[PDB]
Design a protein around this ligand. Sequence first.
Ligand SMILES: Nc1nnc2ccccn12
Length: 165
Amino acid sequence: SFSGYLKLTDNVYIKNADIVEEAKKVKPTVVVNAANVYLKHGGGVAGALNKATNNAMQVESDDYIATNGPLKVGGSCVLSGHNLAKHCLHVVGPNVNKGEDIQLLKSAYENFNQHEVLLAPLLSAGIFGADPIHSLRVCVDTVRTNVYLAVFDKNLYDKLVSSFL
Ligand SMILES: Nc1nnc2ccccn12
């Protein structure tokens, strides 16, 4: 199971870990991808998870987009987890750098409530441009299911735990 996570709340746990290595170690039921509406896994968590699947996640995502069209910002889709998880929940958080609306972050976290336990990154953090402390606050106030957050950056992980209200 998940090991070395610090408990933040009744259901939110956090660890300084690379979500790719965490997924390969644990092989959880659900790994969350920090997706964009086109499921174009270029950089950040998405590029990293996709590279770990040897691009199989992108091939599957392009077929999903050809059939269904793009996701909504705040939306999600369940696809295969490939070598990382049983499933991958592709969640679209608002990308502040691309000028998207930060109010959609709560809607993005609501997708986690459809899964009992998830391995996930902080939505809209990293290359998505939002304040990670705000993302963790929205996470703990929105997600009711068991969420194991993997924070790649050590200094950010320290800042998050030490500043947690
Ligand atoms: N393995 C890896 N490479 N880049 C990133 C970014 C976020 C989380 C994991 N990452």
